[PDB]
């Protein structure tokens, strides 16, 4: 009763070496678990360039060409899921 993403990530063109963000703000009951996937695979933390900040913001520094793709916010709850994705083009 039950997860809504109120702000999700936004489609972007980003420059190589730059820094960009994936934001996700979710409500629900109970509090939803948030996870991020890129082209269907769960995003790394082992990558020093990719950091979890506060207020829903996942931040990616030193953009590479291979960061291009689809990034999905999945908000979960034993009773439901929501998803909100964006396409990031690094060039």
């Amino acid at each position, epitope marked *: 009763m039950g997860p809504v993403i109120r702000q999700g990530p936004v489609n972007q063109t980003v420059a190589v070496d730059g*820094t*960009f*963000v994936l934001s996700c703000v979710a409500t629900g009951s109970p509090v939803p678990t948030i996870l991020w996937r890129k082209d269907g695979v769960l995003v790394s933390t082992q990558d020093s360039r990719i*950091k979890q*900040l506060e207020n829903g913001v996942l931040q990616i520094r030193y953009a590479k060409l291979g960061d291009t793709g689809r990034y999905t916010c999945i908000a979960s709850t034993p009773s439901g899921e929501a998803t909100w994705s964006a396409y990031i083009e690094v060039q």
Partner: antibody, heavy 122, light 108 residues
Framework: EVQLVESGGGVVQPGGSLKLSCAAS????????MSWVRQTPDKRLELVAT????????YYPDSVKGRFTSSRDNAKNILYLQMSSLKSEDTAMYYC???????????????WGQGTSVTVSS | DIQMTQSPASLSASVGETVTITCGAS??????LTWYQRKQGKSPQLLIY???NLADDKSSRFSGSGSGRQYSLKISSLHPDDVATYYC?????????FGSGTKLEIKR
């Protein structure tokens, strides 16, 4: 104590080239990302170069991309900024700064040098 | 590019006053903001990061607030040594643009 010492500033002709240095000491330099920030005469500030601990990753904003290149020597503990095709807008004070490690890991600069002045002129 | 606009350009208050400096972003930056203090003859120092986290090594007189596009640095119980130029910086996405500064002066 952390010490960051800029040198290499001075006058340079429009279209000319300069290399700045930053002699770092009192912290484990090879282990920290490093930035160069400049302060123009109106007192505005602008980040113009970041470089990671190992030197493998570098960033430059649009204003100086192509024209500015950063490097570091992790044995001697010196940071560099090579500048070229200089113009009046690059006329500024140039600071070398250490990137903090924070929790959460926001980007921030926790120690800065005193600066070296670059004047673009004939 | 995100445009930071800072306010006021300059400001003065008396010892013991509480003062507020503001930073407006051109879009939501989700607390991904930092504040710096620069004293005459010194290098800048970090005061606040992430909009609200005071740096390990500064005074609890400093406090940072806000969300969305609008942010505040509060300096309670002003001291003479607070005299400085204050800067905000966007650190959400590049270019990491700074605010243009607030010079704080003391009335005596």
């Amino acid at each position: 104590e952390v010490q960051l010492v800029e040198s290499g500033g001075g006058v340079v002709q429009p279209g000319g080239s300069l290399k700045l240095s930053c002699a770092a000491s009192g912290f484990t330099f090879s282990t920290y990302d490093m930035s160069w920030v400049r302060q123009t005469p109106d007192k505005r500030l602008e980040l113009v170069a970041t470089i990671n601990s190992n030197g493998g990753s570098t960033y430059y904003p649009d204003s100086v991309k192509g024209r500015f290149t950063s490097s570091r020597d992790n044995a001697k503990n010196i940071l560099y900024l090579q500048m070229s095709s200089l113009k009046s807008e690059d006329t500024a004070m140039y600071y070398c700064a250490r990137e903090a490690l924070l929790r959460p890991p926001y980007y921030a600069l926790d120690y800065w040098g005193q600066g070296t002045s670059v004047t673009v002129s004939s | 590019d995100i445009q930071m606009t800072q306010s006021p350009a300059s400001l003065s208050a008396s010892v013991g006053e509480t003062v507020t400096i503001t930073c407006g972003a051109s879009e939501n930056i989700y607390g991904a903001l930092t504040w710096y203090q620069r004293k005459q003859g010194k290098s800048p120092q970090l005061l606040i990061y992430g909009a609200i986290n005071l740096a390990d090594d500064k005074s609890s007189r400093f406090s940072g607030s806000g969300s969305g596009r609008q942010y505040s640095l509060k300096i309670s119980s002003l001291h003479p040594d607070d005299v400085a130029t204050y800067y905000c910086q966007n650190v959400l996405s590049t270019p990491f643009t700074f605010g243009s500064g607030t010079k704080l002066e003391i009335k005596r």
